[PDB]
């Protein structure tokens, strides 16, 4: 009876592991004698735990190693594991202890380098600059990191290493594909969460005896699952990089299966509706994009709201959103030789979001071309002037608080921006869908084998709250006719 969680991440196409990958586990002790991980696991000779049995200490870590690589109930059956002990027998560690841990992994790699590394951090503390920093340096070293979202029924951005954008952050869903509710508490959520995975009622190795098993739940277990999927993917394609892998996870997850009613109203659009899965069979080039949301700006006269991509990604377009709709729009601006998406707030506005479309386009140099506010009869226009450049998005911001084909068309009083990228082998098309006045949502989707790179409402609008991509669907929220405009591209 294959466990639900294993059924769930498996896609309908299978054949009835993670051999050449190493997965480091920063948690409790583990019982390496257990028949589930017997042969898989190597205890590293590292400890850093705070002051406070044989079974209970091993309890947590043993179960998680099982999920990752366990013979009967694990994801990456051929994975090789290594446990660093940074939590004590009550599950409690220190930030310094984790830092020394992470540093021990990097020195280990430097001394005996092996193949691709996966580091699993099934712990959370409060937001920590230093812990997020250390993670960021380790990711730039080339090590893939997976962390638990946290079990506090709260915004993941308030927790570390969850809040660290480099780390892959994983929330927990149950067998109903719903967010886990451990008592009053439960899975964390929000924009710092990358995807969700099985994390309720997960059968796994128990420390009580060498052939014992037990159900545990948490965002730890969810994390463990994706660590296993990472290992699988990385074994199959060892030349993959962190950015590549994060995009593939997102691409191959189940979409729109989480009932988002369980999240707080403010956090729904922010929380990605994705549940982890292994890729299907044959994969071999493809254009991958994801939506990066900013934090809510703050209610003041001028919006400090920024969305950033990762170093290796290109910002292909930029939109914005507000619950009220009071907003001055968005612009893309260069920052440290890399484009960022910035949204502005209106006088009445309670605050805005900046939404960024980040894509893996190994080609390069995505520039911004802006035209200033022009005139009535004209409107406002920008096109890509660069050699062999394609238009991938159209932003538009304006100064006046009071509202009133190869190029971007904008309002007479609006300042319009065009994102252009050097992608001579990428063709792009526009697609749109217009609906009469009193509707509140309007969507358009790119067809099979195309990627959505820009999403916007038709410039001659009426009452629009904002626009944003959700996977490959462009969504325009509203309160003549309102019309969604999507720019789709492929190789």
């Amino acid at each position: 009876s294959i466990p639900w969680n294993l059924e769930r991440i498996t896609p309908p196409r299978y054949r009835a592991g993670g051999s050449l990958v190493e997965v480091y586990l920063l948690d409790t002790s583990i019982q390496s004698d257990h028949r589930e991980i017997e042969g898989r696991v190597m205890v590293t000779d590292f400890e850093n735990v705070p002051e406070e049995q044989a079974s209970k200490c091993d309890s947590h870590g043993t179960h998680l190693a099982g999920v990752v690589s366990g013979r009967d109930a694990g994801v990456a059956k051929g994975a090789s594991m290594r446990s660093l002990r940074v939590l004590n027998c009550q599950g409690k560690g220190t930030v310094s202890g984790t830092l020394i841990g992470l540093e021990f992994i990097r020195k280990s790699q430097l001394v005996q380098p092996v193949g691709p590394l996966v580091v699993l951090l099934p712990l959370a503390g409060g937001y920590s600059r230093v812990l997020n920093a250390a993670c960021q340096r380790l990711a730039r070293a080339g090590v893939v990191l997976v962390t638990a979202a946290g079990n506090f029924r709260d915004d993941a951005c308030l927790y570390s290493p969850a809040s660290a954008p480099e780390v892959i952050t994983v929330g927990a869903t149950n067998a109903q594909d719903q967010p886990v509710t451990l008592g009053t508490l439960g899975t964390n959520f929000g924009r710092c969460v990358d995807l969700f995975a099985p994390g309720e009622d997960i059968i796994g190795a128990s420390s009580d005896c060498s052939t014992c098993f037990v159900s545990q739940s948490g965002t730890s277990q969810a994390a463990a699952h994706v660590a296993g999927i990472a290992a699988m993917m990385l074994s199959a394609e060892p030349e993959l990089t962190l950015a590549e892998l994060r995009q593939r996870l997102i691409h191959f997850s189940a979409k729109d299966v989480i009932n988002e009613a369980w999240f707080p109203e403010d956090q729904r659009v922010l929380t990605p509706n994705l549940v982890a899965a292994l890729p299907p069979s044959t994969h071999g080039w493809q254009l991958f994009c994801r939506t990066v949301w900013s934090a809510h700006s703050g209610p003041t006269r001028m919006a400090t709201a920024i969305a950033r991509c990762a170093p290796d990604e290109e910002l292909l377009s930029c939109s914005s959103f507000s619950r009220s709709g009071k907003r001055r729009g968005e612009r893309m601006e260069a920052q440290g030789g890399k484009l960022v998406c910035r949204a502005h707030n209106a006088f009445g506005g309670e605050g805005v979001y900046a939404i960024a479309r980040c894509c893996l386009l190994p080609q390069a140099n995505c520039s911004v071309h802006t035209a200033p506010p022009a005139e009535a009869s004209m409107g406002t226009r920008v096109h890509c002037h660069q050699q062999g450049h394609v238009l991938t998005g159209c932003s538009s911001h304006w100064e006046v608080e009071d509202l009133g084909p190869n190029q971007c068309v904008g309002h007479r009083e609006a300042s319009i921006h065009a994102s252009c990228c050097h992608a001579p082998g990428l063709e792009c098309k526009v697609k749109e869908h217009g609906i009469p006045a009193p509707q509140e949502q309007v969507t358009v989707a790119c067809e099979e084998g195309w990627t959505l790179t820009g999403c916007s409402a038709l410039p001659g609008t009426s009452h629009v709250l904002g626009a944003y991509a959700v996977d490959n669907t462009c969504v325009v929220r509203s309160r003549e006719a309102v019309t969604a405009v999507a720019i789709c591209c492929r190789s």
């Epitope: 028949r35 017997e38 190795a205 009580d208 005896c209 014992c212 098993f213 037990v214």
Partner: antibody, heavy 118, light 107 residues
Framework: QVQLVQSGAEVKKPGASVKVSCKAS????????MHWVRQAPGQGLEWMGE????????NYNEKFKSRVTMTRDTSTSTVYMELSSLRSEDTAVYYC???????????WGQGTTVTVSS | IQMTQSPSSLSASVGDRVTITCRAS??????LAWYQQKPGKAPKLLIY???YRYTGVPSRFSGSGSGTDFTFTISSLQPEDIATYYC?????????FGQGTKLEIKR
Amino acid sequence: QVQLVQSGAEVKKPGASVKVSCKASGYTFTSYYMHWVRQAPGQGLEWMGEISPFGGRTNYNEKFKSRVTMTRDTSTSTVYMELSSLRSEDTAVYYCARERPLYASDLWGQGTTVTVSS
Amino acid sequence: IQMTQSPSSLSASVGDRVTITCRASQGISSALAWYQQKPGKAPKLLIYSASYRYTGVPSRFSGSGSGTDFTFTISSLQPEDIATYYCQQRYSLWRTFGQGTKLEIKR
């Protein structure tokens, strides 16, 4: 397709020995432990011992430790079991079964009937 | 470890609930499996880890328990269930079966 097939029935004289074969098919033979349990006509199931996949290390029940000997064969994916100093009480059906960590030995052999008689 | 299984035999009529207990000499967490033996055939694994039913095993069958105190149950008895049922303990080095419970369909 997945199956354990074991050797046919045999007679042996009191004192003699017998090697019962048991061959794995369909699955990775090297992934699990292999158990032997027997059943006398009037008794019920009695556990003999087990042999691990890695290193062919073994562990036997204390009732048989002096007599029983188990051994695997990597190439042909088959596990053997030899019992010596055969007495009347050894007349039984002998089963091999793969045991996995979670799914406590889900796949069994057909049984091999052994008869100790003159 | 010592596995005391009871009753040694049980005659029940079709549609009846049937309970078999199984008591270890010491606490074995949940390292317990139940098997069914049809006469002539080898034992078939029914329940593993004390609670979980194996694939292609009717959902009439179920198990529960932890530590020293386990039970196996047929929710509704059927003719196909004529067999001898054994609990196996797998907590220690050596494996131990219970004595066995023989089912008879009362008719």
